[PDB]
Coordinates of C-alpha atoms and ligand atoms in Angstrom, one line a residue:
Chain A
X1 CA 17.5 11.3 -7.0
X2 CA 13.6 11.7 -6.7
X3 CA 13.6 8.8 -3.5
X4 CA 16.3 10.4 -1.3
X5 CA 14.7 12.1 2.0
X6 CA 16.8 15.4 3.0
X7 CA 18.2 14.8 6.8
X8 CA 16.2 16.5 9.0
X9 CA 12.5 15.2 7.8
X10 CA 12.5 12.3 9.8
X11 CA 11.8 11.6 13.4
X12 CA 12.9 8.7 14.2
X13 CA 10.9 7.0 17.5
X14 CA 10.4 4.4 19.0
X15 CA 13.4 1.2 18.2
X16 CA 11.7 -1.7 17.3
X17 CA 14.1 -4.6 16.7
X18 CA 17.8 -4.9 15.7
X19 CA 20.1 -7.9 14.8
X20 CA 21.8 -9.3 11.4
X21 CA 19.6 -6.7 9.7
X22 CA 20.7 -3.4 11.0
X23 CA 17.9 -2.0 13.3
X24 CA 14.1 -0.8 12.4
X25 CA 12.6 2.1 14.1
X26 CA 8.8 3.6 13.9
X27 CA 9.0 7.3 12.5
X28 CA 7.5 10.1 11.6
X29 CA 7.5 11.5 7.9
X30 CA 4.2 12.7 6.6
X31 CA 2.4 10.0 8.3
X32 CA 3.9 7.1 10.0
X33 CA 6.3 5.4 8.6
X34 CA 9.7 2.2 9.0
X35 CA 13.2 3.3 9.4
X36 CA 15.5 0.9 8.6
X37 CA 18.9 2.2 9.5
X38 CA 22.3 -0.2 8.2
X39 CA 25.2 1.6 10.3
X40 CA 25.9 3.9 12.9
X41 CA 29.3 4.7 12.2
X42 CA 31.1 5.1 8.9
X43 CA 29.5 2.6 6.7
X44 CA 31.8 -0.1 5.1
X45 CA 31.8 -1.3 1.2
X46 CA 29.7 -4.0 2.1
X47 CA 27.3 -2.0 3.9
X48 CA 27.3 0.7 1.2
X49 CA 26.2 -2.2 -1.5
X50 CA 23.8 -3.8 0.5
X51 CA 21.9 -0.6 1.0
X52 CA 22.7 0.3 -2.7
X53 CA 21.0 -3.3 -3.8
X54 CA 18.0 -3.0 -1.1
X55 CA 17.0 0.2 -2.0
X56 CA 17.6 -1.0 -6.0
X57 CA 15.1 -4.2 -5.1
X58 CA 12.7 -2.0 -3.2
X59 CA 12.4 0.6 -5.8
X60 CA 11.4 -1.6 -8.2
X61 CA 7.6 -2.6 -6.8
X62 CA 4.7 -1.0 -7.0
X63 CA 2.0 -3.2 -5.9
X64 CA -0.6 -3.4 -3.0
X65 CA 0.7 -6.7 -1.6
X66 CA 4.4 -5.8 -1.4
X67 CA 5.7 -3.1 1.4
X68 CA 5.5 0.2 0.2
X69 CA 9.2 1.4 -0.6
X70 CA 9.2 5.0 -0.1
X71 CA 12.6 6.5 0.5
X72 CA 16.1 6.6 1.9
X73 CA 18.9 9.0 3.4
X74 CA 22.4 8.8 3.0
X75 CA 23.3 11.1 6.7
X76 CA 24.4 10.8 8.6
X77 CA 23.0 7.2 8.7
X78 CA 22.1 4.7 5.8
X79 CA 18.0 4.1 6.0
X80 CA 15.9 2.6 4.4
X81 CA 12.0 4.2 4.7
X82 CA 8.8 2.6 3.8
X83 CA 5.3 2.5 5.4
X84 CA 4.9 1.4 9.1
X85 CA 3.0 -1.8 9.2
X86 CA 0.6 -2.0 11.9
X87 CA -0.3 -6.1 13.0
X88 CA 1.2 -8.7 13.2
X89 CA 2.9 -11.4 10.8
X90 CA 1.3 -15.0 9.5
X91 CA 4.1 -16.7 11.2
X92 CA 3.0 -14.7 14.9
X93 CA -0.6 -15.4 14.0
X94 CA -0.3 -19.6 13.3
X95 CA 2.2 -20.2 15.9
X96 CA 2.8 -17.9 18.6
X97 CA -0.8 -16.9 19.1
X98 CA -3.4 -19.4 18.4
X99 CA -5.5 -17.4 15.6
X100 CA -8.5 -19.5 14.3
X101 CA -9.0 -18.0 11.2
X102 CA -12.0 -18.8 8.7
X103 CA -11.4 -20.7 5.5
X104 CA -12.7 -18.0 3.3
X105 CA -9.7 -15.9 5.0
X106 CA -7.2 -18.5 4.7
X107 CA -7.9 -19.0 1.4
X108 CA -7.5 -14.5 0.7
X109 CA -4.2 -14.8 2.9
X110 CA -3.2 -17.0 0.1
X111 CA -4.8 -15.5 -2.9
X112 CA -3.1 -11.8 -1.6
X113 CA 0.2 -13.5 -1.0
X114 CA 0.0 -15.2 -4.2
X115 CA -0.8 -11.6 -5.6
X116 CA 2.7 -10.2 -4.4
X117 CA 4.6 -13.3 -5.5
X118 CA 3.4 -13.1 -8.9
X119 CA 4.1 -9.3 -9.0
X120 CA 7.7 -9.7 -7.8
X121 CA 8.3 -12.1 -10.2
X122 CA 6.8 -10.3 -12.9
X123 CA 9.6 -7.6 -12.2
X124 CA 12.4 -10.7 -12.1
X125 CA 12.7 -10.3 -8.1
X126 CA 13.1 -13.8 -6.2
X127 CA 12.5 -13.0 -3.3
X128 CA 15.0 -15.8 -1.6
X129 CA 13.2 -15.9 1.6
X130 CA 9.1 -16.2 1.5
X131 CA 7.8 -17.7 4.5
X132 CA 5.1 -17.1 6.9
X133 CA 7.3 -14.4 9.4
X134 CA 7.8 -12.4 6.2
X135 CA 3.7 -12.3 5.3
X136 CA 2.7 -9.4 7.0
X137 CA -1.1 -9.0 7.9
X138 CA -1.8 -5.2 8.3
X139 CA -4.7 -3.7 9.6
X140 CA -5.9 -7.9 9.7
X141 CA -7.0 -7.2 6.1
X142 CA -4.0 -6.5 3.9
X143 CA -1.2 -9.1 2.8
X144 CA 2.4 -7.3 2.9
X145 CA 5.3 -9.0 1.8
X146 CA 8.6 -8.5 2.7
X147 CA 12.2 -9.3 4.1
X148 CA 11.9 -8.4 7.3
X149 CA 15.0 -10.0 8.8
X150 CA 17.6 -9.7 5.6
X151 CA 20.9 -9.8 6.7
X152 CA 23.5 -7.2 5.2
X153 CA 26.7 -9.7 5.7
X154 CA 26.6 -12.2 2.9
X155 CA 28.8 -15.3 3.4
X156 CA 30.9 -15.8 0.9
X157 CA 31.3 -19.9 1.2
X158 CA 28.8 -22.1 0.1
X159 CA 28.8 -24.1 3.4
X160 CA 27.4 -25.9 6.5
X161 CA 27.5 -22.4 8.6
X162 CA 25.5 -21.0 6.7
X163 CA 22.2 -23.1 8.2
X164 CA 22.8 -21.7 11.8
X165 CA 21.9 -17.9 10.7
X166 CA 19.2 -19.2 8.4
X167 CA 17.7 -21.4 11.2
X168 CA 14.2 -19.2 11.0
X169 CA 14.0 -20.3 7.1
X170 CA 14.9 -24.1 7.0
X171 CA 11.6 -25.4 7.3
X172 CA 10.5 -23.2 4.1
X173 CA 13.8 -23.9 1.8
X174 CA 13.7 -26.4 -1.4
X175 CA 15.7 -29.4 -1.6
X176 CA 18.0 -28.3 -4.3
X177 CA 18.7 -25.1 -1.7
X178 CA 19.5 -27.3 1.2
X179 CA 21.8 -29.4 -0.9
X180 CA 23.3 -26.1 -2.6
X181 CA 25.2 -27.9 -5.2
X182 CA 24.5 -24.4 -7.2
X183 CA 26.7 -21.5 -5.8
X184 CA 23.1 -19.5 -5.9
X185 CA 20.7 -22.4 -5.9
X186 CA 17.6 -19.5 -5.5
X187 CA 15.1 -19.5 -8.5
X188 CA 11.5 -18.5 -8.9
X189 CA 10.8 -22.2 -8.3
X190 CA 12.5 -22.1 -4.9
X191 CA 10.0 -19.0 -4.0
X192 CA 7.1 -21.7 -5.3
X193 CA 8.1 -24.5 -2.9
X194 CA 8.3 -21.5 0.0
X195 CA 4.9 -21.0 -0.8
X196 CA 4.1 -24.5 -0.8
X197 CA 4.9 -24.4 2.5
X198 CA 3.0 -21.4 3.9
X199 CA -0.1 -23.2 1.9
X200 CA 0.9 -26.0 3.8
X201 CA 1.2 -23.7 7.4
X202 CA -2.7 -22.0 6.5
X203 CA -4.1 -25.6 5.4
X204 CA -2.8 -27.1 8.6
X205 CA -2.8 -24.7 11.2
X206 CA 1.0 -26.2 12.0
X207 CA 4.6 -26.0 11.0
X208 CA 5.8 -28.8 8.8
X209 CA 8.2 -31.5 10.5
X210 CA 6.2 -31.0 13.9
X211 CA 7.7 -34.6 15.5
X212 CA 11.1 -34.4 13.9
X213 CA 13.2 -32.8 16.8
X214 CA 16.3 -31.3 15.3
X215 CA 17.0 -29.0 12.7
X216 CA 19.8 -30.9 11.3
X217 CA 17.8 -34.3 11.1
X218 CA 15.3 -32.0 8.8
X219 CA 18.1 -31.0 6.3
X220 CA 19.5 -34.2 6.0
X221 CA 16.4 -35.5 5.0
X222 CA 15.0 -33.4 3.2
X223 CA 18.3 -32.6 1.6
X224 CA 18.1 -36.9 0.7
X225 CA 14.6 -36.8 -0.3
X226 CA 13.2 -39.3 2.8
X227 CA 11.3 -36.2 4.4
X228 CA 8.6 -34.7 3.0
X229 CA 5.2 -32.5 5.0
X230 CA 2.5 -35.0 6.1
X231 CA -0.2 -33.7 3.5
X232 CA -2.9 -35.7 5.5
X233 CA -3.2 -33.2 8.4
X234 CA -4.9 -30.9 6.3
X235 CA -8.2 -29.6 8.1
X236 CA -11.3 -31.2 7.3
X237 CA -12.4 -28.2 5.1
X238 CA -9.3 -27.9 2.8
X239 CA -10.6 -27.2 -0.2
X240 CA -9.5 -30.1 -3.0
X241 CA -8.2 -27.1 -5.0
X242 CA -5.7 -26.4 -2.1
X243 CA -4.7 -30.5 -1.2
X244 CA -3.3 -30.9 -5.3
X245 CA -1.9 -26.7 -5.3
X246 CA 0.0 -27.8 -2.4
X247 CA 1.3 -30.7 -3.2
X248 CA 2.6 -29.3 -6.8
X249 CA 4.4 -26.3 -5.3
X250 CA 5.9 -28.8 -3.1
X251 CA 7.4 -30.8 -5.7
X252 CA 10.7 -32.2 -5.0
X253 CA 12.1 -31.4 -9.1
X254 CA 12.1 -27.8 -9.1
X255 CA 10.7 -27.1 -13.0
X256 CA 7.9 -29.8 -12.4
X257 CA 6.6 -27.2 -9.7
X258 CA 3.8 -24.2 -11.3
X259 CA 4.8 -20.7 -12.0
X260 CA 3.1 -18.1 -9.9
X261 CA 0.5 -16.9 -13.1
X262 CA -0.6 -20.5 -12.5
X263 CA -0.7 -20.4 -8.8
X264 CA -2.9 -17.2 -8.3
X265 CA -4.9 -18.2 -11.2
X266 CA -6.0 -21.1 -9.3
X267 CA -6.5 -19.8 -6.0
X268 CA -8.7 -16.9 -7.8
X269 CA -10.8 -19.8 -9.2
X270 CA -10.9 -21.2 -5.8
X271 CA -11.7 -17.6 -3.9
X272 CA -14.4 -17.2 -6.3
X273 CA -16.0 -20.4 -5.9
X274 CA -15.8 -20.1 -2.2
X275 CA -17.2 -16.9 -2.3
Chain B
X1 CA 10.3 1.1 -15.6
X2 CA 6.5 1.2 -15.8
X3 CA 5.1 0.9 -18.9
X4 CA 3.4 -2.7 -19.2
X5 CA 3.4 -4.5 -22.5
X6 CA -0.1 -5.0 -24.5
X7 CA -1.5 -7.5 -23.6
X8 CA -1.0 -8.6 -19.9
X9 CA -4.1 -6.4 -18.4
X10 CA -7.0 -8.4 -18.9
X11 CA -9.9 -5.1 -18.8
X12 CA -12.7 -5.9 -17.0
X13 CA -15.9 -4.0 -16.1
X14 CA -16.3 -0.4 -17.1
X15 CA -16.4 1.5 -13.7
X16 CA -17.2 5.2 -15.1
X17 CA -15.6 8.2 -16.9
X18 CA -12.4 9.8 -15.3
X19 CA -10.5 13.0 -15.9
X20 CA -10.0 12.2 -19.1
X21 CA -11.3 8.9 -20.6
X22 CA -13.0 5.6 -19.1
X23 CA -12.1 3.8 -16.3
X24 CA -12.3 -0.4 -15.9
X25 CA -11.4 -2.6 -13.2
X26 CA -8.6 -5.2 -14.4
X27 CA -6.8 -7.9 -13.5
X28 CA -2.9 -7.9 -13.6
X29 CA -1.4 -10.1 -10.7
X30 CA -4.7 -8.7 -8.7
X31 CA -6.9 -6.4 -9.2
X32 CA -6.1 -3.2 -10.5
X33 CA -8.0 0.3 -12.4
X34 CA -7.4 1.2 -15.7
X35 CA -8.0 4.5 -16.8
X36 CA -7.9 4.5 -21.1
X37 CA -8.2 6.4 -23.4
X38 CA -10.6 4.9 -25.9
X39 CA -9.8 6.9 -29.4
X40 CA -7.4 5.3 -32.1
X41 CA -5.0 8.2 -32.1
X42 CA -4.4 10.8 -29.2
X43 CA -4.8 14.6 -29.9
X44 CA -1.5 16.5 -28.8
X45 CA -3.6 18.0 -25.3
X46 CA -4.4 14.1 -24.4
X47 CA -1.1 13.2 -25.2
X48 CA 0.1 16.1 -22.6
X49 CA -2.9 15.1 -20.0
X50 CA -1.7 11.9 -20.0
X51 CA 2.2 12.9 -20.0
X52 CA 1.6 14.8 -17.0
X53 CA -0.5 12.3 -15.4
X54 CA 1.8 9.7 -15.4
X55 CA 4.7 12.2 -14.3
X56 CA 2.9 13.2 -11.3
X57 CA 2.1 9.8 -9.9
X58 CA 5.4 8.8 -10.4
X59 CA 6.5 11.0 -7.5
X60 CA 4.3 9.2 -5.4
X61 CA 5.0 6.4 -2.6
X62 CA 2.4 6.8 0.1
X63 CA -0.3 4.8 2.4
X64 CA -2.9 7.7 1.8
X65 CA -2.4 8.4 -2.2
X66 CA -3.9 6.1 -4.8
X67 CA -0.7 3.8 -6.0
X68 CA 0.4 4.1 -9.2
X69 CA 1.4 0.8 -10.5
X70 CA 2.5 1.3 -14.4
X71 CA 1.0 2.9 -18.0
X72 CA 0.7 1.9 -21.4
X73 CA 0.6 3.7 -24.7
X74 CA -0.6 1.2 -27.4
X75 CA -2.9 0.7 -28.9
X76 CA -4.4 3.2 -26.6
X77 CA -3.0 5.3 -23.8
X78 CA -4.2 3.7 -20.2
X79 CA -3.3 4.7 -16.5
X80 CA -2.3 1.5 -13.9
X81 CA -3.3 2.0 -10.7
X82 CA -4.3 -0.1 -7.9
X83 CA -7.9 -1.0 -7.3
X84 CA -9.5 0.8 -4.6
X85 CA -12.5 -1.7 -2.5
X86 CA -15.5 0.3 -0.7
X87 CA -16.5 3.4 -1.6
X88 CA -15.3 7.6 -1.4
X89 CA -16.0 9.3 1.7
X90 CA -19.1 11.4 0.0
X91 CA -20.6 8.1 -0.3
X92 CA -20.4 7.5 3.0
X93 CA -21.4 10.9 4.8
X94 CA -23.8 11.9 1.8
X95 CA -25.6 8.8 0.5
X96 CA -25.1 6.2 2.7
X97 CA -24.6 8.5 5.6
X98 CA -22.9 5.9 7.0
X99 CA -22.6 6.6 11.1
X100 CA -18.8 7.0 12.1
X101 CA -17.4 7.2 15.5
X102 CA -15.8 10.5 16.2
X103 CA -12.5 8.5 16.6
X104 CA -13.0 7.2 13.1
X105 CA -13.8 11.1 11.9
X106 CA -10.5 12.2 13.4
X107 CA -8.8 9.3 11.7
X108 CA -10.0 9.8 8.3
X109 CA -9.2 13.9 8.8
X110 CA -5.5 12.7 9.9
X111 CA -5.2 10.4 6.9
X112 CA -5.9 13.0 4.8
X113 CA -3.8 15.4 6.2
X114 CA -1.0 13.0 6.1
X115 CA -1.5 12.5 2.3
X116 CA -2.1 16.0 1.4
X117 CA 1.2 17.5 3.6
X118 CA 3.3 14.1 1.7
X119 CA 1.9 15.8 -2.0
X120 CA 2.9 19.5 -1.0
X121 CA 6.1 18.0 0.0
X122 CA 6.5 16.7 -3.2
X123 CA 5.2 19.7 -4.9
X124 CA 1.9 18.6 -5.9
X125 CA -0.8 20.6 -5.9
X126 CA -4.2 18.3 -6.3
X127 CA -6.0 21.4 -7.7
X128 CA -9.6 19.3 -7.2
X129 CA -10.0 18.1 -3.2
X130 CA -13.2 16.9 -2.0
X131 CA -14.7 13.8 -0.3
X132 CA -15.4 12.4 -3.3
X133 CA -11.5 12.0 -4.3
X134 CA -10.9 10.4 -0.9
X135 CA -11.5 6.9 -1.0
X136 CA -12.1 4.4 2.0
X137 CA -10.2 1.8 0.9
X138 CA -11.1 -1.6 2.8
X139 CA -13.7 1.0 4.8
X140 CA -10.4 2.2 6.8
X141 CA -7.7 3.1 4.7
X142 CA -7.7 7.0 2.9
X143 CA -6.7 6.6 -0.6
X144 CA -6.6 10.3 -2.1
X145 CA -6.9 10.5 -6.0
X146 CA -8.4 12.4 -8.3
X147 CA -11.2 9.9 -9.4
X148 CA -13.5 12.6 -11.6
X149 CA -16.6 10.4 -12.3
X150 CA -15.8 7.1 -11.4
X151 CA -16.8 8.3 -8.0
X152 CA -19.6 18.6 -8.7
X153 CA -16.2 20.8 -7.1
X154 CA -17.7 24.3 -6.3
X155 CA -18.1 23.2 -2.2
X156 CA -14.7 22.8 -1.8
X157 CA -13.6 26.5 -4.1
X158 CA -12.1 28.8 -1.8
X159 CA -13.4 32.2 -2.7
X160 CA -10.5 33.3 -4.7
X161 CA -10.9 29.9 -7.2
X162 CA -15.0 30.4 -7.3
X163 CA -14.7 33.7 -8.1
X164 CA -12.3 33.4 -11.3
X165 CA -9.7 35.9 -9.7
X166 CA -7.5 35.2 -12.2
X167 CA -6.3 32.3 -14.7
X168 CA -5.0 30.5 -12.3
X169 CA -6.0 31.2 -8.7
X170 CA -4.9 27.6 -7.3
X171 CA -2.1 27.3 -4.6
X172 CA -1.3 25.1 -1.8
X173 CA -4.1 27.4 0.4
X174 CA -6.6 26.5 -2.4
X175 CA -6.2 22.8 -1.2
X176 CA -5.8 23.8 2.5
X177 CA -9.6 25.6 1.7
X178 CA -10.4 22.4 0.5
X179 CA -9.5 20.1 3.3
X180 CA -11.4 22.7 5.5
X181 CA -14.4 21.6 3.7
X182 CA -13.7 18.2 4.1
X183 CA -13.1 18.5 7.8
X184 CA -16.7 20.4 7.9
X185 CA -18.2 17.5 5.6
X186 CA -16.7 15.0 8.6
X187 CA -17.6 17.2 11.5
X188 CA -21.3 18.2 10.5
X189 CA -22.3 15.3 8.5
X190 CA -23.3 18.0 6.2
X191 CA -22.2 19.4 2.8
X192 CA -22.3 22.9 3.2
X193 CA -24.7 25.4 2.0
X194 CA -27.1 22.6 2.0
X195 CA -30.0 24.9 2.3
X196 CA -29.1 27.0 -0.2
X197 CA -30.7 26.2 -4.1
X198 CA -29.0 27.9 -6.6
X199 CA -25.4 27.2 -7.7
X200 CA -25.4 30.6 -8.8
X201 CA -25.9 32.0 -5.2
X202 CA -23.0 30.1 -3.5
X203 CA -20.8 31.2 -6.8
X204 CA -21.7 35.0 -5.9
X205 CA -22.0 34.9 -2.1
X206 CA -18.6 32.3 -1.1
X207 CA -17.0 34.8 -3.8
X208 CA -17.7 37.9 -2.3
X209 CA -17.3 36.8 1.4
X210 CA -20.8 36.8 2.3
X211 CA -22.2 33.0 2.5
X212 CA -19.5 30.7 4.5
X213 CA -19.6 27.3 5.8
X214 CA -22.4 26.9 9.0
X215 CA -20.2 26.1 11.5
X216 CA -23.4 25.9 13.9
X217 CA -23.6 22.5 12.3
X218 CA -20.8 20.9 14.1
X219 CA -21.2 17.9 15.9
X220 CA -21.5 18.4 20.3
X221 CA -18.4 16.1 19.9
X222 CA -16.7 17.7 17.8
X223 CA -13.1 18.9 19.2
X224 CA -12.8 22.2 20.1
X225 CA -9.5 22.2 18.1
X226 CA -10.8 20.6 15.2
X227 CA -13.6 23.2 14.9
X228 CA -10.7 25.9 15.6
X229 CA -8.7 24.4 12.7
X230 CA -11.3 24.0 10.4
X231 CA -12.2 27.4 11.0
X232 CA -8.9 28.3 10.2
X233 CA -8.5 26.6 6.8
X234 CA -11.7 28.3 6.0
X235 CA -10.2 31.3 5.7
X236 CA -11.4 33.6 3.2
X237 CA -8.3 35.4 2.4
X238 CA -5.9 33.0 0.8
X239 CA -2.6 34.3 3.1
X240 CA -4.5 33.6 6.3
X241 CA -4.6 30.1 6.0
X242 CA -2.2 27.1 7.6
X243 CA 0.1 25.0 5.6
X244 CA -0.1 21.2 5.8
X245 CA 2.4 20.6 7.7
X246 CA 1.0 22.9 10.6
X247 CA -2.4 20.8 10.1
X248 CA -0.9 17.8 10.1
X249 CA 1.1 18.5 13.5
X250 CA -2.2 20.0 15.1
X251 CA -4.4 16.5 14.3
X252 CA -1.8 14.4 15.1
X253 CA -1.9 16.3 18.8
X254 CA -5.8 16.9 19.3
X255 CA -6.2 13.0 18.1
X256 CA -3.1 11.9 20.7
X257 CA -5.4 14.0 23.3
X258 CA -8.6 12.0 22.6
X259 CA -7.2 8.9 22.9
Ligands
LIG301 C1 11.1 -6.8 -2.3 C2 11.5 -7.8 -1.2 C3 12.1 -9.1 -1.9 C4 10.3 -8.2 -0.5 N1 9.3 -8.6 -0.1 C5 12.5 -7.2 -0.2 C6 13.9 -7.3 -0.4 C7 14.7 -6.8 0.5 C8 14.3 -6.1 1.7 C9 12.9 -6.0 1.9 C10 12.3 -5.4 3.1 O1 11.1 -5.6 3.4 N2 13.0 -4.3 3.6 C11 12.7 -3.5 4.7 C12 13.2 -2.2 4.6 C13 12.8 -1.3 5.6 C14 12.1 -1.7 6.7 F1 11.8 -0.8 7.7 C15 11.7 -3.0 6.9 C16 10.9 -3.5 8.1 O2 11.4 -4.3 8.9 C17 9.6 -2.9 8.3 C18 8.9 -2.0 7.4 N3 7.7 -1.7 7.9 C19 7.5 -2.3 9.1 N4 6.4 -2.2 9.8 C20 6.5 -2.8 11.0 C21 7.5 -3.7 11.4 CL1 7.4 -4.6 12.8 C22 8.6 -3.8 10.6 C23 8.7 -3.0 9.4 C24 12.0 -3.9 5.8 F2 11.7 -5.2 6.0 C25 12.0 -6.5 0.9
LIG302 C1 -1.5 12.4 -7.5 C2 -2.9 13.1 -7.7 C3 -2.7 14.6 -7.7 C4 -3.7 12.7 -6.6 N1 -4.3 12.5 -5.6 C5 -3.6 12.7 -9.0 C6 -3.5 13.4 -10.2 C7 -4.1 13.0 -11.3 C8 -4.9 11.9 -11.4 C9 -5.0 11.1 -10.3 C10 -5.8 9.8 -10.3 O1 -6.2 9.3 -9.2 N2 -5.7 9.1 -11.4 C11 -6.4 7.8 -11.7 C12 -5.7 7.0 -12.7 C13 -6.2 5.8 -12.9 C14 -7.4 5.4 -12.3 F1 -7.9 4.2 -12.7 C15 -8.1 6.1 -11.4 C16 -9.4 5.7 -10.8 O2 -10.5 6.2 -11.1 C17 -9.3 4.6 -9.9 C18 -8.2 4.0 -9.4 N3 -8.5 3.0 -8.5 C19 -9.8 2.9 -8.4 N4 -10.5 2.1 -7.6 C20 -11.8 2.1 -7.6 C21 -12.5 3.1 -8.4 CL1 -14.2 3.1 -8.3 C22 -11.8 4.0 -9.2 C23 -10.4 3.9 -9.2 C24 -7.6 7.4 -11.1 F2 -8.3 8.2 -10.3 C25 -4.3 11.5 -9.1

């Protein structure tokens, strides 16, 4: 195959983070580029399909605002290479760091993100976990998405556990995925509602649910229907556009929320008239 | 798979002409170029140009070549690529003469490098360097492609393409030549030969060995490296010159050194 990168070619530098994911390391490799590498020893079946379905996922995009796929090797590890992302995410910039940003660029955070959605579900990818940690902002002018925390051990029980591990996603998950009375309750209208949510996080400047105290008091109710975001601490110049985009990507009835043509066509309208 | 159905890529404004055809900005989930070809049925050579078009972009995933996003074929035969915002890096040194840092000149040379060692890696030879193929994208980021008008190659001939040695006198140390002419373009602010008139003069003279790049030209901040380097991807015999991956490595040092 065209994609695979002879061992060797790679120098693989500097280790940036490891956990559930495997571990991600800056390289070398015409240029700068991500190492994602999903064993050290003797990779198991599991390991050898989720690297088989990443690289599968990956291979499929082509677009500015998605992470540039650009190859793997087999040995003597399992990697995973695309570019090297140089920044910092949405979720680092709202939360952990105090960036005031202009509306103009909230708005083209949006309108980019809204760019790669619609692309990846163009090519029939749900992405399964949009939120604001996974919106990369490169070189501060360049939306990125993508998973940048996906575990390779899937559970296989539809259960309670499950919320621990996925304790960085809960405040971005739709109802019908909290209650999970699907066995895969993910859709294209799931990744919508995630996106309500980061709307929610740039309208805002905060994190939804910012005086509820526990995690498991937020999946209860939103898993009941009794908690919804306060939509009134929008800033003073939300746009109206944004206030009713939210609020319909937010929708509690998965197929009453807008498909992403609908979504970036609006928030092109709105980055226009802004403009 | 890559071919996009009729229909989805709303064309917009007509940019210019491009290696073969006419080239429109678009909209399909964000902006987008579309290169088409505007006749209602392709001769057999466009059908090739375009075959081999596609095939080579294809084989490319990288931060500093122009991404290829998808093709069609009907009703007419059309190239997908991202948009590109800002403007080539002739613009910038030759019209605009936009005023770059030296840092920024060294980063825009390593950029280059990186894209040009990732298409000989690949097997690619570009066949038509120049500043005008490298694009600024978002004023920072190199995008190489090969852009024909939508953003005139005798500069950037090494003397055994400009003087017609043969049928096909291109290699990997063609482009090397190339790049040397781009780093001389960066370093001098200067397209070279700028003093001379006649086309016909730089044809005969960079052909026979006796008109070169004026390396005098440099700026006093110029590297001493770089110059070396340039100096030796201007190399008038073919053999002499460095491969990519050799320029590439030497950048990446004299850039690490300046800062
Ligand atoms: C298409 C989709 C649904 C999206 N969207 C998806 C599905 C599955 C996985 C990924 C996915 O993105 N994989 C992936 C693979 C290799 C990596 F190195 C990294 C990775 O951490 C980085 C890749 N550059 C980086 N620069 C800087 C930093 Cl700090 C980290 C990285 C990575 F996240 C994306
Ligand atoms: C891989 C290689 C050897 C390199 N390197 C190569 C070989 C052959 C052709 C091309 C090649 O680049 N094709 C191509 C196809 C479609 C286009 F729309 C455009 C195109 O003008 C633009 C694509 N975005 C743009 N943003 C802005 C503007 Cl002003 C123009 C464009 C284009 F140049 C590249």
């Amino acid at each position: 195959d065209d994609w695979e990168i002879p061992d060797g070619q790679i120098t693989v530098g500097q280790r940036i983070g490891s956990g559930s994911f495997g571990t991600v390391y800056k390289g070398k490799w015409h240029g700068d580029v991500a190492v994602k590498m999903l064993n050290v020893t003797a990779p198991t079946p599991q390991q050898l399909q989720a690297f088989k379905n990443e690289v599968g996922v990956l291979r499929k995009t082509r677009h500015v605002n998605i992470l540039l796929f650009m190859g793997y090797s087999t040995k003597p590890q399992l990697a995973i290479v695309t570019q090297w992302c140089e920044g910092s995410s949405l979720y680092h910039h709202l939360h952990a760091s105090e960036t005031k940003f202009e509306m103009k660029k909230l708005i083209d955070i949006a309108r980019q993100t809204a760019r790669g959605m619609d692309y990846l579900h163009a090519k029939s990818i749900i992405h399964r976990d949009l939120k604001s940690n996974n919106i990369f902002l490169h070189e501060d002018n360049t939306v990125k998405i993508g998973d940048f925390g996906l575990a390779t051990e899937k559970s296989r029980w539809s259960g309670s556990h499950q919320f621990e591990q996925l304790s960085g996603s809960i405040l971005w998950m739709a109802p019908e995925v909290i209650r999970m009375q699907d066995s895969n309750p993910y859709s294209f209208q799931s990744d919508v509602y995630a996106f309500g949510i980061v709307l929610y996080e740039l309208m805002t400047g905060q994190l939804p649910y910012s005086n509820i105290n526990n995690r498991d008091q937020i999946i209860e109710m939103v898993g009941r229907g009794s908690l919804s975001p306060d939509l009134s601490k929008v800033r003073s110049n939300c746009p109206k556009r944004m206030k009713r985009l939210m609020a319909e990507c937010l929708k509690k009835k998965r197929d009453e929320r807008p498909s992403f043509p609908r979504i970036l066509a609006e928030i092109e309208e709105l980055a226009r008239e802004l403009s």
